[PDB]
Amino acid sequence: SKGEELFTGVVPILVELDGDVNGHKFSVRGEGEGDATNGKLTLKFICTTGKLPVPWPTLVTTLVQCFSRYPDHMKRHDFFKSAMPEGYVQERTISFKDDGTYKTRAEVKFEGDTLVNRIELKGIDFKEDGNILGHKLEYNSTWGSPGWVRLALCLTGLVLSLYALHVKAARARDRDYRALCDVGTAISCSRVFSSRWGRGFGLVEHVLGQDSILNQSNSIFGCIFYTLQLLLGCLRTRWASVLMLLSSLVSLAGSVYLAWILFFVLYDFCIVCITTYAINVSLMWLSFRKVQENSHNVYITADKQKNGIKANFKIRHNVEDGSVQLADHYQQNTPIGDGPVLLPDNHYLSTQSVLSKDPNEKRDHMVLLEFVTAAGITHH
Ligand SMILES: O=C1c2ccccc2C(=O)C1C(=O)[C@H](c1ccccc1)c1ccc(Cl)cc1
Numbered sequence: 001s002k003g004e005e006l007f008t009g010v011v012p013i014l015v016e017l018d019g020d021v022n023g024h025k026f027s028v029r030g031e032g033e034g035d036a037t038n039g040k041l042t043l044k045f046i047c048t049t050g051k052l053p054v055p056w057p058t059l060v061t062t063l064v065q066c067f068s069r070y071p072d073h074m075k076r077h078d079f080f081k082s083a084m085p086e087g088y089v090q091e092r093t094i095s096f097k098d099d100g101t102y103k104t105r106a107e108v109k110f111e112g113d114t115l116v117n118r119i120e121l122k123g124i125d126f127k128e129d130g131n132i133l134g135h136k137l138e139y140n141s142t143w144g145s146p147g148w149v150r151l152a153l154c155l156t157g158l159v160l161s162l163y164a165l166h167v168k169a170a171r172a173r174d175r176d177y178r179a180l181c182d183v184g185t186a187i188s189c190s191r192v193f194s195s196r197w198g199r200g201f202g203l204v205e206h207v208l209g210q211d212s213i214l215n216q217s218n219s220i221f222g223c224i225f226y227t228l229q230l231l232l233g234c235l236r237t238r239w240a241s242v243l244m245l246l247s248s249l250v251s252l253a254g255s256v257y258l259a260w261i262l263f264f265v266l267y268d269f270c271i272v273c274i275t276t277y278a279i280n281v282s283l284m285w286l287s288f289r290k291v292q293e294n295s296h297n298v299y300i301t302a303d304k305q306k307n308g309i310k311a312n313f314k315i316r317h318n319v320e321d322g323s324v325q326l327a328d329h330y331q332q333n334t335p336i337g338d339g340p341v342l343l344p345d346n347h348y349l350s351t352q353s354v355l356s357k358d359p360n361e362k363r364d365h366m367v368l369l370e371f372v373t374a375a376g377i378t379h380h
């Protein structure tokens with residue numbers, strides 16, 4: 001499109017937002033530059049009216065997708081650049097799960113040589129004690145709390161593993177030892193842990209042999225597993241999530257096998273064993289959900305009825321208590337001018353944000369670095 005030649009250089013950016021959230025009114029100004037060739041934008045935002053009544057991360061999506069890098073084979077699907085320089089109107093509803101809602105309207109046009117994004121934001125039905133009005137979101141921290149849930153599952157698993165190990169040693173030093181989990185002649189964790197399936201899952205011998213250092217009491221694997229689940233719960237990166245998922249899968253397989261042993265070989269209803277199986281399914285589901293929550297894509301489809309596009313996506317904001325806050329975005333773009341625009345096939349934008357602070361800025365502010373690439377259409 002013709003508007004493309006407006007984006008091959010470095011473009012200055014002005015962003016102006018006036019907001020009102022549960023009656024707390026505020027203004028934000030941002031300035032910076034966009035480099036669509038690299039899909040890179042760098043902007044600094046100031047709250048001009050004082051302290052921002054909402055967390056900065058929640059405003060990132062509102063505070064210029066024409067700076068996305070569309071690969072050469074997808075240039076015919078770049079609506080945002082084709083609406084320039086006249087621009088487009090971008091409207092959104094952002095629904096925060098179990099809390100309030102943002103409603104936004106923006107005009108994005110060229111004024112002289114400046115790309116200008118002017119926004120009105122109205123937020124309603126927010127909880128004063130919630131994560132938003134309560135300022136409980138993490139800004140950019142790379143480690144933090146694991147969350148009450150993960151903490152309970154992992155600590156419980158760790159204590160039960162510790163006691164299991166203690167039982168195995170005590171029973172090995174005394175046949176008449178009766179454990180806490182020795183409930184009856186048919187419920188004896190002592191008998192379970194001291195069975196050959198109590199070491200290396202009764203499998204490590206047949207593969208790596210009996211001297212292998214992997215031939216540890218199953219509860220040793222328990223200690224390491226729950227410990228790593230708990231520390232990985234403290235990291236805020238993709239790879240920690242995948243590791244949590246893989247370890248959860250291994251624990252799942254081992255738990256299914258050990259349950260089969262419990263009911264069809266040992267004829268034992270080991271209450272502590274069933275409990276660790278349940279905890280392990282819980283962690284399986286949590287790591288599965290975590291991996292799903294890792295996706296940051298903007299899903300774009302053409303809207304012929306408005307000669308523009310529509311998009312929807314989910315943002316997950318980290319909460320200081322270790323939980324996550326969902327923000328369901330629904331988005332509409334319509335051209336301002338009357339010249340031709342590109343209506344794309346289905347695709348998505350992949351975006352990466354880096355939030356930081358300016359050590360020299362005394363006003364409430366956000367430094368933002370962003371890389372955005374279009375994808376979702378295979379080049380073949
Ligand atoms: O030694 C064991 C055994 C022998 C026969 C039948 C069942 C089991 C176990 O549950 C197993 C455990 O003790 C052990 C376990 C049981 C109870 C509490 C903490 C740890 C365990 C290890 C790995 C997984 Cl993934 C699940 C459970």
